[PDB]
Structures are given as C-alpha cells and as structure tokens.
Amino acid sequence: NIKDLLDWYSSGSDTFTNSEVLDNSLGSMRIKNTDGSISLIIFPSPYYSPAFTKGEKVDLNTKRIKKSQHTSEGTWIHFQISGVTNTEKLPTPIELPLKVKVHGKDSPLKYWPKFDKKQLAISTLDFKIRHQLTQTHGLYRSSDKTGGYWKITMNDGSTYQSDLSKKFEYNTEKPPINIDEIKTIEAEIN
Numbered sequence: 001n002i003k004d005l006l007d008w009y010s011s012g013s014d015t016f017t018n019s020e021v022l023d024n025s026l027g028s029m030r031i032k033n034t035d036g037s038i039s040l041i042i043f044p045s046p047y048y049s050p051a052f053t054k055g056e057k058v059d060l061n062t063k064r065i066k067k068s069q070h071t072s073e074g075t076w077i078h079f080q081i082s083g084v085t086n087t088e089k090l091p092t093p094i095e096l097p098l099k100v101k102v103h104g105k106d107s108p109l110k111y112w113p114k115f116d117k118k119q120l121a122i123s124t125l126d127f128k129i130r131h132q133l134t135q136t137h138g139l140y141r142s143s144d145k146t147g148g149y150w151k152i153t154m155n156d157g158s159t160y161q162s163d164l165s166k167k168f169e170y171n172t173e174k175p176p177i178n179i180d181e182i183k184t185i186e187a188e189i190n
Contacts, residue, residue, distance in 0.1 A: 001165065006140040008063070008167060009130040014039075014078060016060040018087055021052045029084060031058065037068075037076040041084060045173040048121070050084045058084050059117060061124040081123075085176045088118035096179060098129065101188040102137055102145065110136045119176040122160055125152065126168045129187060139164065139189055150187040152177075164189065 016033040023030040029050060031039040039060060043049055052058050062083030069077045093114035100107045112132055120128075129150045133139035140146060147165040154160075154177065162168055164187075 002140055002146055005130075005146075005165075005167065006134065009127060009140065010134045013063050013083075013124070013127055013131075014060060014080060018057045019060055021054055021056045021058055023054065024050060024052055031060065031084070033060070035076075037078055039078045039080055041080045041082065043082060043084075044171050045082075048082065048173045048175050052084070057087050059087050060084060061117070061120060063123075063127060082170055082173060083121045083124045085117065085119045085121055085124075089116050090118055090180060092116075094180065096182060097184045098132070099184065099186045100133070100137060101186070103190065107137055107189075115179050118180065119178050121176045122152075122174055123168050123170060125160075125177075125179075125185075126150065126162050129185065130164065133164070133187060133189060137189055145189045148187065148189040150185065152185045153183045155181050155183050157183075 019031045019033040019039065021029060022032050027043055029041045031041065033039055041062060060083055062080040064078055065081050066079035071077060093116040095114050098109060098112055100109065130139060134141065138145050149164055150162050152160040
C-alpha cells in the first residue's frame with residue numbers, strides 16, 4: 001500500500017481558479033480551465049455532488065487519476081477526481097491550525113502553506129495535509145511512519161477524519177467546508 005500512498009501524496013495536485021463549468025451530469029463534470037485545458041472530474045460520493053450549472057465559475061484543487069491526454073486539437077484533457085468548489089477567496093490568506101504527533105510526540109511544522117479559499121473539498125484538505133506529512137514528517141518514507149490519521153474539528157464541533165494507512169475515501173466524501181470555520185486539524189503518525 002505504501003508505494004501507492006507515497007505516489008499519490010508526495011506528488012503534486014492541480015490547482016485552477018475560475019474554471020468554467022461546461023457540463024455537470026451523471027456524477028461527472030466537464031470543466032474548461034483558463035489555460036485552455038479541459039478537466040473531466042468524477043464525483044463518486046453520494047454526499048458530494050457539485051450543483052454548479054453550465055457557465056458557472058469554479059475552482060479546482062484536485063488530483064489526476066489517469067494520465068492527461070494531449071488531443072489532436074492541441075488541448076490537454078485531465079482526468080481528475082473531486083476538488084470542485086466555488087471561487088470565494090478570503091480577505092487574506094490564513095493559517096490553518098495543524099498539530100502533528102509522531103509516535104506520541106508533538107512535531108513542529110515546516111512549509112505549511114496559508115489558505116486563501118473560503119471553501120475547500122475535504123479531499124483537497126486530505127492531500128494538503130498528507131503532502132505536508134510526507135514532505136516534512138516522513139510519512140510513507142519509513143517503515144515506522146505508514147499509518148495514523150488526521151482529524152478536522154469544526155467550530156460547531158463536527159469532525160472529519162481520515163486513516164493515513166488507506167487512500168482517502170472519495171466514495172463517501174462529504175461536501176466542501178468553509179476553512180475559516182475549522183477549529184483544529186490534528187494528525188498523528190504511527
């Protein structure tokens with residue numbers, strides 16, 4: 001499972017802002033990005049179905065599930081999953097409270113980016129978190145760091161959790177959350 005996790009999380013993600021919705025139906029979205037590329041994004045979760053209609057603008061913070069294809073028309077087509085949110089941006093980028101424990105002991109962060117989007121898909125948060133964990137805390141880089149979890153507690157107390165030993169559960173993904181409403185984010189590596 002490690003190679004798969006290391007592969008998925010140490011690599012980057014695609015970020016596109018103000019992409020236009022071409023189509024939204026039957027669990028997938030066809031989106032036109034400002035760089036001219038076309039994104040075909042699937043939404044497998046019955047709990048997360050973007051309601052954006054044709055012509056609406058959206059932001060993408062997503063991962064490719066297949067190799068992008070350069071068409072004969074000179075257009076890149078990306079095959080991504082989830083990560084479609086509105087375009088609202090916070091007045092100024094904010095620091096999300098991420099507390100990390102590795103084998104029981106607190107572990108200070110390094111290179112934890114600020115966030116400027118009002119809403120982010122839970123899967124986006126998941127990859128941002130684990131990416132941080134793999135780059136600075138060695139998650140998936142050594143046999144003593146292949147599991148654990150991350151947990152986001154909202155201000156109203158609701159929580160979101162993800163097992164670090166498994167790939168994110170896109171199939172049950174909940175709707176995007178307002179990050180300015182996140183109380184804490186904690187992650188333990190075991």
